[PDB]
Design a protein around this ligand. Structure first.
Ligand SMILES: *[C@@H]1O[C@H](CO)[C@@H](O[C@@H]2O[C@H](CO)[C@@H](O)[C@H](O)[C@H]2NC(C)=O)[C@H](O)[C@H]1NC(C)=O
Ligand SMILES: *[C@@H]1O[C@H](CO)[C@@H](O[C@@H]2O[C@H](CO)[C@@H](O)[C@H](O)[C@H]2NC(C)=O)[C@H](O)[C@H]1NC(C)=O
Ligand SMILES: *[C@@H]1O[C@H](CO)[C@@H](O)[C@H](O)[C@H]1NC(C)=O
Ligand SMILES: *[C@@H]1O[C@H](CO)[C@@H](O)[C@H](O)[C@H]1NC(C)=O
Ligand SMILES: *[C@@H]1O[C@H](CO)[C@@H](O)[C@H](O)[C@H]1NC(C)=O
Ligand SMILES: [Ca+2]
Length: 765
C-alpha cells in the first residue's frame, strides 16, 4: 500500500493506485513515502523509519537492509535506529580494565585522529573527554607550526632531526626548494626519521592513513599499506566509512594502526567533525570494537594571534635588503644567490645589524647555536643560521607588501576519567609503540614518561647506568706540591672529611644522590666539602658538576684568595697563571653558605671555571642576588651548576675532539654554556634535603657568550636584565642530561616513570 520494497516499478499497487516510478513526481502519483524510501535514502548516511528493513538499493551510500550486518554495509545508526540499541554517545562510560576485542583482533587497533578550530555543542568529542583521558595543553615543539608538528607527533623526532623544519625550506645539498604547494613536498629526501606507520609495518603490523603529514610520501622508500593522497574534497562521512571498511578487512590485510587528519558557522563546522566522530564511535560499537580500539584525538585549539598592526619590517633596520627572508612568526634569513653563496653569506653581520636597534623591538635576532637550547632548532642545513625570535602576537616581514592541541584518549589500554598534566608531543611516538606493542625507533621522547596515561604500561623505564667510576682525589698531604702560580696572602684540613663527615654532606648536599656519569672513559673524581660536593673532570681540569643545598635564608666573597687543591694532581688542575677577556669564575659561590672560614673550602683551583668577563657579571648576580630570593621562595633549594660543551650544537655533550676553543695558550676547554638546575620541593613545608613527595624543578642552560648583546643591557643595571636572560634560557632536566652526559636523581625514592615525568617538565613563562 506504499513505496516500501517497491522503489521504481511498473506496480500500480498502492494507497488509491499510487505509483513508485521516477515519473510519479511529475504525475503527482507518488505514494506519500516515495521521496524518503526511494529518493533521499540513496543520498543520506543514516537509517530512519522508511529505510529500516528496506530492499537494498544499489545507488545508496550505506545500507539499512536486513542483511547489512552480515554484508558489513550498515549505516552507523542501524543498530540504534533499526534495533533500538542505546547509542555509544547516550550509553554510560566504559569501565573495561582489559581490551574486549572481537575474534581475530589479537591486538587492539590504534586510531590517531587530528582536528582544528561547550559540551552540548560537541557531544561525542565531549563523551571522550568525559569517559577517557585528557591533557590540559599538549606542548608543541619549535616552530610551533602544524605541518612540522604533525610529523613530529608520528616520528618522535624534533624538526631538526626529522627534516620538516618549516612549511617552506631550501636544502643546499639537494639544491631543491620545499613548499606545500610544490610537487617537492612529495620528494622522500625531505622526509627523515621513521614514522609510526613504518615502525608498525617493519614490525609485522599493517597501517593505514586517511591523510597525515608524510603518509602520502614513500618515506624510506615505502608508503603505508593503505593511504589516501591529500584532498579536502571528500566528505567526513565518506572518510569515516572508509576507515570502518579498513577495520572490516580480513585479519591478514587489516591494519593495526590508523592516522586520520581533518582541517558563527564555526560551530556549524565543528559540529560536522563531531558528527563524523560520533559516526566512527557508532561504527565501532556495531563491530564490538568500541571497548577494543584505543583512540587518541588531538584538537588544535590554537588561534591566529596576529594583526596587521603587530608587524615588524626589515626596511626599518636595513637601508637595502638583498637577502631572502622566510617570513612570519619564526623567520630565517639567507642569501638570494643559492647554492653558490649559501655558506659564504655573512649571517653574523645580519644578527649584529638587527641587534638592539629599537627599544620597543618586537623580535630578537640569533645565530642558530645561540638560540635557547630547549628549542632544539639548529642541527640541520635546512635551518638557516640567521633566525629571528619574534614576540608572541607579532610577525616579521621583508617589506610592506601556531599548534596548541588538546590531547584526548579513550580505550582499554588508557586510564579512565583522568586529567593528565601537559607534555611535549615528542613523547607520543613511544606511547604509540607501546599501545601497538612494538619497539620505538631512536626518537627524542623519553620512554616511560607517559606510562601514567596507561592502565598496564608495556615498557618499564630504568635508570641509565654510569659508564665511568669515580677514582682518585684522596687527601694525601695538607700542603700542595705545585703552588700553581696562585695567591692568598691570608685550612686545607677542612678538605679532609671523615666517613661520618662525608655521609653528612652527602645527606645534605646530594639529597637525590649524585649525578651519574653516563659517559664512557670519562676520567673523574668526587670532591667532598662541608657545604658542597663537586664532580671533577680531570681532562678538562674543571668540575663537570657541583651540588649544594642552600637552606632558607634569615656576606661578601673573600678577596685575592686562591690556592691549589691538595687532592687534585697539578697535571689535572687549572693554574692562576692561565688567566690574567676570559677569567676564572667560581662554579660554587663561596659566600652562599657558612662563615668567613667556610669560604676557604670554595677558594680552590677545583672550584674554578673559565668565564668571559661579561658572563661572570650575569653569573655572579644570579648567585649573589637571584638565588637567595629563590631559596626564600622555595624554603631552601638544591643547586646543580656545571660547564656544558656543545660546539657542534647537536644537543649532546661534545666528545673531546669536538671542542674547538680553549683558554689562550692552555688545554682548558671553554664551556659553550653553563647549567643551573634548581631542585627544591613541591611541598614547601619541607626543605629539598628532606622531601618525601615530588620535587619542583627549575633548569637553565644559559649560553656562555663573551658579550651580553642578547640581553641588550645598554646602561641598565643587572636587576633589569639578568633574571630575564636566565628565564629566557629555561630548559628541561633531560635537555641538561643530554648536553652533559650526566644523569640526575638516581637516588630519589619514586618510580623511574615518575622521575622521567619530572625530567621532561619545562617550567612555564
Ligand atoms: C629556490 O627558490 C628561490 C626563490 O625563492 C630561487 O632563487 C633564485 O636563485 C638565483 C640563483 O640560483 C638567484 O640569482 C635569484 O636572485 C634567486 N631569486 C630569488 C627570488 O631569491 C632558487 O633558484 C630556487 N632553487 C630551486 C632549485 O628551485
Ligand atoms: C633526537 O633523536 C635522534 C635519534 O635518537 C638523534 O639523532 C641522532 O644523533 C646522532 C648524533 O648526532 C647521530 O649519529 C644519528 O645518526 C642521529 N639519528 C637520526 C635519526 O637523526 C638526535 O640527536 C636526538 N636529539 C637530541 C637533542 O638528543
Ligand atoms: C629504512 O628501511 C630499511 C628496510 O627497508 C630498514 O632496514 C631501516 O631501518 C629503515 N630506516 C629508517 C630510519 O626508517
Ligand atoms: C598517489 O599518487 C601517486 C602519484 O600521483 C600515485 O602513483 C598513487 O597511485 C596514488 N595513490 C593513492 C592511493 O591515491
Ligand atoms: C604537604 O605536607 C603536609 C605535611 O607536611 C601534608 O599535610 C600535605 O598533604 C602535603 N601535600 C603534598 C601534596 O605533599
Ligand atoms: Ca655535542
Amino acid at each position: 500500500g506504499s513505496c516500501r520494497k517497491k522503489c521504481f516499478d511498473s506496480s500500480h499497487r498502492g494507497l488509491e493506485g499510487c505509483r513508485c516510478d521516477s515519473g510519479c513526481t511529475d504525475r503527482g502519483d507518488c505514494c506519500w513515502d516515495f521521496e524518503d524510501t526511494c529518493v533521499k535514502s540513496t543520498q543520506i548516511w543514516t537509517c530512519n523509519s522508511f529505510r529500516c528493513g528496506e530492499t537494498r538499493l544499489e545507488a545508496a551510500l550505506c545500507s539499512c537492509a536486513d542483511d547489512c550486518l552480515q554484508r558489513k554495509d550498515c549505516c552507523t545508526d542501524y543498530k540504534a535506529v533499526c534495533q533500538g540499541e542505546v547509542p555509544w554517545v547516550t550509553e554510560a562510560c566504559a569501565s573495561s580494565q582489559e581490551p574486549q576485542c572481537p575474534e581475530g583482533f589479537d591486538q587492539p587497533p590504534v586510531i590517531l585522529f587530528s582536528m582544528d578550530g561547550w559540551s552540548t555543542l560537541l557531544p561525542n568529542i565531549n563523551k571522550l573527554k568525559t569517559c577517557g583521558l585528557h591533557s590540559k595543553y599538549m606542548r608543541a615543539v619549535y616552530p610551533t607550526k602544524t605541518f612540522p608538528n604533525h610529523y613530529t607527533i608520528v616520528t618522535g623526532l624534533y624538526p631538526e632531526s626529522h627534516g620538516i623544519i618549516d612549511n617552506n625550506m631550501y636544502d643546499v645539498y639537494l639544491n631543491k626548494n620545499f613548499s606545500l604547494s610544490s610537487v617537492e613536498k612529495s620528494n622522500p629526501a625531505w622526509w627523515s626519521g621513521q614514522p609510526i606507520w613504518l615502525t608498525a609495518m617493519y614490525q609485522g603490523l599493517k597501517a593505514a592513513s586517511y591523510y597525515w603529514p608524510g603518509s602520502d610520501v614513500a618515506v624510506n622508500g615505502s608508503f603505508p599499506n593503505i593511504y589516501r593522497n591529500y584532498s579536502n574534497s571528500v566528505p567526513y562521512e565518506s572518510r569515516i566509512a572508509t576507515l570502518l571498511q579498513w577495520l572490516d578487512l580480513p585479519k591478514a590485510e587489516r591494519p593495526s594502526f590508523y592516522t586520520i587528519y581533518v582541517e558563527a558557522g564555526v560551530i556549524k563546522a565543528l559540529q560536522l567533525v563531531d558528527d563524523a566522530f560520533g559516526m566512527l564511535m557508532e561504527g565501532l560499537k556495531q563491530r564490538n570494537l568500541h571497548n577494543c580500539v584505543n583512540i587518541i584525538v588531538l584538537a588544535d585549539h590554537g588561534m591566529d594571534q596576529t594583526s596587521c598592526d603587530r608587524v615588524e619590517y626589515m626596511t626599518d633596520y636595513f637601508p637595502e635588503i638583498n637577502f631572502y627572508m622566510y617570513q612570519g612568526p619564526a623567520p630565517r634569513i639567507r642569501t638570494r644567490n643559492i647554492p653558490q653563496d649559501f655558506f659564504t653569506f655573512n649571517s653574523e653581520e645580519i644578527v649584529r645589524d638587527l641587534s638592539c636597534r629599537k627599544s620597543d623591538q618586537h623580535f630578537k635576532p640569533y645565530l642558530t647555536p645561540d638560540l635557547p637550547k630547549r628549542l632544539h632548532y639548529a642541527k640541520n642545513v635546512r635551518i638557516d643560521k640567521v633566525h629571528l625570535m619574534v614576540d608572541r602576537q607579532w610577525l616579521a616581514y621583508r617589506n610592506k607588501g601556531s599548534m596548541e592541541a588538546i590531547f584526548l584518549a579513550h580505550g582499554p589500554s588508557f586510564k579512565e576519567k583522568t586529567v593528565i598534566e601537559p607534555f611535549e608531543n615528542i613523547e607520543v611516538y613511544n606511547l604509540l609503540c607501546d599501545l601497538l606493542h612494538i619497539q620505538p625507533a631512536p626518537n627524542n621522547g623519553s620512554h616511560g614518561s607517559l606510562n601514567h596515561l596507561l592502565k598496564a604500561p608495556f615498557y618499564q623505564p630504568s635508570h641509565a647506568e654510569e659508564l665511568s667510576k669515580s677514582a682518585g682525589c684522596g687527601f694525601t698531604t695538607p700542603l700542595p706540591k705545585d703552588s700553581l702560580n696562585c695567591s692568598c696572602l691570608a685550612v686545607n684540613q677542612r678538605l679532609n672529611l671523615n666517613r661520618g663527615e662525608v655521609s653528612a654532606t652527602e645527606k645534605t648536599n646530594l639529597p637525590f644522590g649524585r649525578p651519574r656519569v653516563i659517559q664512557k672513559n670519562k676520567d673523574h673524581c668526587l670532591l667532598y666539602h662541608r657545604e658542597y660536593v663537586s664532580g671533577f673532570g680531570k681532562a678538562m681540569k674543571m668540575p663537570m658538576w657541583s651540588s649544594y643545598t642552600v637552606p632558607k635564608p634569615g656576606p661578601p666573597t673573600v678577596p685575592d684568595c686562591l690556592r691549589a687543591d691538595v687532592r687534585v694532581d697539578p697535571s689535572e688542575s687549572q693554574k692562576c697563571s692561565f688567566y690574567l677577556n676570559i677569567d676564572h669564575g667560581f662554579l660554587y659561590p663561596p659566600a652562599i653558605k657558612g662563615n668567613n672560614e667556610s669560604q676557604y673550602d670554595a677558594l680552590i683551583t677545583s672550584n674554578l671555571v673559565p668565564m668571559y668577563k661579561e658572563f661572570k657579571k650575569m653569573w655572579d648576580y644570579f648567585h649573589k642576588v637571584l638565588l637567595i630570593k629563590y631559596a626564600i621562595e622555595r624554603n631552601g633549594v638544591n643547586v646543580v651548576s656545571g660547564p656544558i660543551f656543545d660546539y657542534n650544537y647537536d644537543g649532546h655533550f661534545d666528545a673531546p675532539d669536538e671542542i674547538t676553543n680553549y683558554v689562550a695558550g692552555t688545554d682548558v676547554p671553554v664551556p659553550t654554556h653553563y647549567f643551573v638546575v634548581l631542585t627544591s620541593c613541591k611541598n614547601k613545608t619541607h626543605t629539598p634535603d628532606s622531601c618525601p613527595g615530588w620535587l619542583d624543578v627549575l633548569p637553565f642552560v644559559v649560553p656562555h657568550r663573551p658579550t651580553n648583546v642578547e640581553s641588550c643591557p645598554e646602561n641598565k643595571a643587572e636587576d633589569l636584565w639578568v633574571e630575564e636572560r636566565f628565564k629566557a634560557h629555561i630548559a628541561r632536566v633531560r635537555d641538561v642530561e643530554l648536553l652533559t652526559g650526566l644523569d640526575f636523581y638516581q637516588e630519589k625514592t619514586q618510580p623511574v616513570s615518575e622521575i622521567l615525568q619530572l625530567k621532561t617538565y619545562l617550567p612555564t613563562f
